A paper describes a structure:
In 2010, Schirmer et al. identified two genes involved in fatty alk(a/e)ne biosynthesis in cyanobacteria: acyl-ACP reductase and aldehyde decarbonylase (renamed as aldehyde-deformylating oxygenase, ADO). The crystal structures of cADO revealed that cADO belongs to the non-heme dinuclear iron oxygenase family of enzymes exemplified by methane monoxygenase, type I ribonucleotide reductase, and ferritin. The di-iron center is contained within an antiparallel four-α-helix bundle, where two histidines and four carboxylates (aspartate or glutamate) supply the protein ligands to the metal ions. The C1-derived co-product of the cADO-catalyzed reaction is formate.
The variants of cADO-1593 from Synechococcus elongatus PCC7942 and cADO-sll0208 from Synechocystis sp. PCC6803 were constructed, overexpressed, purified and kinetically characterized. However, there is only one hydrogen bond between Asn123 and Tyr145 in 1593, and the corresponding residues forming the other hydrogen bond in sll0208 and PMT1231 are Gln49 and Phe150 in 1593. Thr159 of PMT1231 and the equivalent one (Thr146) of sll0208 are also involved in the hydrogen-bonding network close to the di-iron center. We have observed that 1593 is more active than sll0208 against n-hexadecanal, so Thr146, Leu148 and Tyr150 of sll0208 were respectively mutated into the counterparts of 1593 - Leu, Arg and Phe. Since PMT1231 is more active than sll0208 towards n-hexadecanal under our assay conditions (unpublished results), Asp49 and Asn123 of sll0208 were mutated into the corresponding residues of PMT1231 - His and His respectively. cat values of sll0208L148R and sll0208D49H/N123H were increased by 70.5 ± 5.3% and 65.9 ± 4.4% respectively, whereas those of sll0208D49H, sll0208N123H and sll0208T146L were significantly reduced. Firstly, the results of 1593L146T, 1593F150Y, sll0208T146L and sll0208L148R have clearly demonstrated that the side chains of the residues consisting of the oligopeptide (residues 144 to 150 for 1593) whose conformation changed in the absence of the di-iron center had important effects on cADO activity. Unexpectedly, the Y150F substitution of sll0208, in which the hydrogen bond between Tyr150 and Asp49 is removed, had negligible effect on the catalytic activity. The triple mutant 1593Q49H/F150Y/N123H showed higher activity than WT 1593, 1593Q49H/F150Y and 1593F150Y, and the double mutant sll0208D49H/N123H exhibited improved activity than WT sll0208, sll0208D49H and sll0208N123H. Thus, some synergistic effects were observed for 1593Q49H/F150Y/N123H and sll0208D49H/N123H, implying that these two hydrogen bonds are beneficial for cADO activity and the co-existence of two His in both hydrogen bonds is more important than the presence of only one His.
Author numbering: 6 to 228
Write the structure that this text describes.
């Protein structure tokens, strides 16, 4: 009674193959990104490595979700889906731009992911619901290191954060538009995803030190 398309339908499994691949790839990239962040911030290596390892654990849970639905994920699709943000992350990393890397991974992707997971939970099959609930719980019981680091260093980071937001937030809108059709087959509405993302991202920007007016301008950039 949860979805208009049956979990066993080829329509559902086909859409799932791409959305599942996106979540798996996102988690794979989070693992690698956090390990690379530890190069830039060696003083916080233990915490960043712990986060990396947690995201690798999450990746394996989402792989189990695809297996349970008898779906082979389309990993090349997912790799293309993330190419823009992934490329921007790697370029910033190569220039030692920790602030930009953190905005992309710890703020933008983290908010996008939690949005996706929370909208998926109510429409997920019983097995995948439990896995996703566990992932969401983990994100809630662990400190968002990147957010806290940016908050501690806000005054010096502010200018770059504004610049990184302008360059990267429009890629989120692009991603959401790309994903909309498949997400709808899974019972996940674009409006709900956008809402969840803007609340999460906006709250993070507020915690870090941006004003209500600044967040308005920022969280709606390129939309």
């Amino acid at each position: 009674v949860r979805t208009e398309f049956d979990y066993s339908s080829e329509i559902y499994k086909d859409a799932y193959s791409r959305i599942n691949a996106i979540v798996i790839e996102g988690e794979q990239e989070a693992y690698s990104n956090y390990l690379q962040m530890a190069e830039l911030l060696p003083e916080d290596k233990e915490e960043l490595t712990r986060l990396a390892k947690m995201e690798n654990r999450h990746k394996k849970g989402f792989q189990a979700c695809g297996n349970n639905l008898q779906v082979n994920p389309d990993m090349p699709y997912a790799q293309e889906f993330f190419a823009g943000l992934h490329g921007n992350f790697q370029h910033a990393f190569s220039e030692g731009k920790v602030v930009t890397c953190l905005l992309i991974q710890a703020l933008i992707i983290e908010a996008f992911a939690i949005a996706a997971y929370n909208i998926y939970i109510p429409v997920a099959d019983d097995f995948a619901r439990k896995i996703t609930e566990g992932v969401v719980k983990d994100e809630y019981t662990h400190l968002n290191y990147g957010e806290e680091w940016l908050k501690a260093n806000f005054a010096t980071a502010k200018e770059e954060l504004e610049q990184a937001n302008k360059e990267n937030l429009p890629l989120v809108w692009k991603m959401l538009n790309q994903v909309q059709g498949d997400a709808k087959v899974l019972g996940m509405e674009k409006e709900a995803l956008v809402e969840d993302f803007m609340i999460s991202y906006g709250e993070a920007l507020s915690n870090i030190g941006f004003s209500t007016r600044e967040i308005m301008r920022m969280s709606s950039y390129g939309l």
